[PDB]
Amino acid sequence: GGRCLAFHGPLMYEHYQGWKSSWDEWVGYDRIRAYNEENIAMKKRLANLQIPIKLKSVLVDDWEYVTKDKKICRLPADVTVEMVLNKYEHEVSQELESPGSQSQLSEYCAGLKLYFDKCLGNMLLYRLERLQYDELLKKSSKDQKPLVPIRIYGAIHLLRLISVLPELISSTTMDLQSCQLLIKQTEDFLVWLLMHVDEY
Amino acid sequence: DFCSACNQSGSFLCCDTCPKSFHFLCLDPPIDPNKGDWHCNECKFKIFINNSMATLKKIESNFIKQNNNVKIFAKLLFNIDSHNPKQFQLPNYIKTQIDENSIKYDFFDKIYKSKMVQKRKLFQFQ
Amino acid sequence: SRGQYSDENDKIPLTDRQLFNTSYGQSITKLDSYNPDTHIDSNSGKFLICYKCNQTRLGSWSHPENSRLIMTCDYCQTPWHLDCVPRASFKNLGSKWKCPLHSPTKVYKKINYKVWKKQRLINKKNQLYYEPLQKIGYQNNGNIQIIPDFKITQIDENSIKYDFFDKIYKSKMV
Numbered sequence: 001g002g003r004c005l006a007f008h009g010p011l012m013y014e015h016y017q018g019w020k021s022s023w024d025e026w027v028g029y030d031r032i033r034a035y036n037e038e039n040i041a042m043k044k045r046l047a048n049l050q051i052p053i054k055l056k057s058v059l060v061d062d063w064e065y066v067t068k069d070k071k072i073c074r075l076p077a078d079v080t081v082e083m084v085l086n087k088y089e090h091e092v093s094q095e096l097e098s099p100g101s102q103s104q105l106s107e108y109c110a111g112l113k114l115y116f117d118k119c120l121g122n123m124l125l126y127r128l129e130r131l132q133y134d135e136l137l138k139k140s141s142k143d144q145k146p147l148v149p150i151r152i153y154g155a156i157h158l159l160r161l162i163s164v165l166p167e168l169i170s171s172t173t174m175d176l177q178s179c180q181l182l183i184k185q186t187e188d189f190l191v192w193l194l195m196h197v198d199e200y
Numbered sequence: 201d202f203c204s205a206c207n208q209s210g211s212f213l214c215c216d217t218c219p220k221s222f223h224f225l226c227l228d229p230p231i232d233p234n235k236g237d238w239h240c241n242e243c244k245f246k247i248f249i250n251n252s253m254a255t256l257k258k259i260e261s262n263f264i265k266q267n268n269n270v271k272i273f274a275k276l277l278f279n280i281d282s283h284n285p286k287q288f289q290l291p292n293y294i295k296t297q298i299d300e301n302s303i304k305y306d307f308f309d310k311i312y313k314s315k316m317v318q319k320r321k322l323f324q325f326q
Numbered sequence: 327s328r329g330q331y332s333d334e335n336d337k338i339p340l341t342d343r344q345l346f347n348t349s350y351g352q353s354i355t356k357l358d359s360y361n362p363d364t365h366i367d368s369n370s371g372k373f374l375i376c377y378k379c380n381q382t383r384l385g386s387w388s389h390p391e392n393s394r395l396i397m398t399c400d401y402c403q404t405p406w407h408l409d410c411v412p413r414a415s416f417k418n419l420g421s422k423w424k425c426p427l428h429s430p431t432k433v434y435k436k437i438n439y440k441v442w443k444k445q446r447l448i449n450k451k452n453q454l455y456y457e458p459l460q461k462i463g464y465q466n467n468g469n470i471q472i473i474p475d476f477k478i479t480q481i482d483e484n485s486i487k488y489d490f491f492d493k494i495y496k497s498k499m500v
Contacts (some may be wrong), residue, residue, distance in 0.1 A: 001334065005450070063290055094320060097323055099290060099495055100495035101313075101314060101495075103462055104463075106306075107272075108272065110270070121285070172279070175457070181272075
């Protein structure tokens with residue numbers, strides 16, 4: 001189909017056109033069109049968005065509170081996001097999600113875990129919290145093991161993380177209905193945490 | 201001098217390529233200072249991509265062929281070094297082969313969980 | 327020739343050699359005389375296997391009535407018997423013979439109605455813009471292509487199966 005479809009420089013392909021039969025080659029390498037290499041280099045140089053107002057008091061309460069206490073005083077924190085992320089597949093996915101595939105919850109949970117795996121160092125880092133992360137990386141470098149933040153970080157910063165993702169969501173070229181779905185599951189998250197006030 | 205990632209003054213720290221002022225006790229990369237040289241992440245991607253190589257070609261175009269278990273947000277993962285970090289703030293308004301087996305197993309588990317939620321809904325309907 | 331619309335749906339006109347002086351037996355028709363050359367493709371010399379029934383049904387010269395007419399598709403070269411799909415004769419004059427297995431140009435979904443006369447493809451210049459981001463619940467209303475302004479996505483088999491199962495798992499309650 002069409003009139004111009006060639007992996008090499010196009011010669012109105014619909015094999016090297018305009019040449020004899022003793023020049024064919026069908027080996028496999030990388031392919032680039034480049035418009036016949038800029039038309040043989042111009043013929044050899046001419047022949048040479050915000051969260052809804054439902055439970056917004058939490059970040060107001062925690063903005064003043066992290067100035068001197070930072071919401072945590074024990075480095076091996078007993079609160080981990082692993083169980084509260086695992087409970088989503090057993091509590092809200094079996095009740096609120098429409099019958100079908102739970103990919104929109106499980107895949108998003110795995111993506112949130114992957115984002116939390118490397119989100120440290122660039123964002124969500126108060127100054128003394130940065131010092132605490134520095135001392136955690138110092139004490140975790142004595143056995144040349146990777147720093148895994150699933151066992152030393154609480155779930156209290158997850159609310160701030162879903163507060164600070166939407167303005168960097170629109171920082172890249174992205175379709176609007178993906179952001180609509182993002183804010184939809186953010187609304188689902190705040191619906192789930194509306195009555196579960198003990199863990200946060 | 202100043203700190204773009206601290207919104208303060210602090211001490212003075214300089215860089216060989218793209219010299220910017222930051223805190224000496226808090227390095228811009230996540231690697232702790234507790235060094236012989238310091239290289240910022242914006243300095244890194246610049247000297248790596250933004251100088252003369254693959255400006256038109258998207259590096260993140262072929263990043264999906266090896267990454268698994270993240271699909272919704274992938275363009276923002278590429279430019280994780282192009283933007284410098286900053287201190288805490290808040291606006292006043294608010295105040296493929298193994299991957300094929302992996303996705304096949306995920307679809308298998310999702311089909312079984314669909315069977316379980318079908319059983320749950322016909323149990324709760326009756 | 328006179329300045330009419332001519333996309334890939336319409337077949338090229340047949341020449342006078344194939345239409346007037348195409349001998350007697352041939353007569354631009356395979357319904358008459360034994361025509362075993364229509365059952366053999368010149369690309370590989372193998373047998374054209376029909377999609378519905380997996381038989382070429384060439385038959386024998388001693389029993390010409392046991393032979394079944396077959397035709398080659400004009401898009402994917404898929405063989406098809408004349409008795410499986412309801413059709414009397416071949417398709418030589420007019421549009422190209424589109425087998426009933428591809429994407430139709432216009433469909434109807436009565437609910438007044440939506441036509442969706444396809445997008446008839448865009449050339450390989452900068453107008454053809456690709457953006458694969460989301461696989462579940464895109465609502466891209468078609469015009470997709472399969473990989474291993476007019477917005478199109480690089481969809482695969484997994485995403486199609488996912489949204490199909492999602493839609494028929496929401497629709498089985500109604």
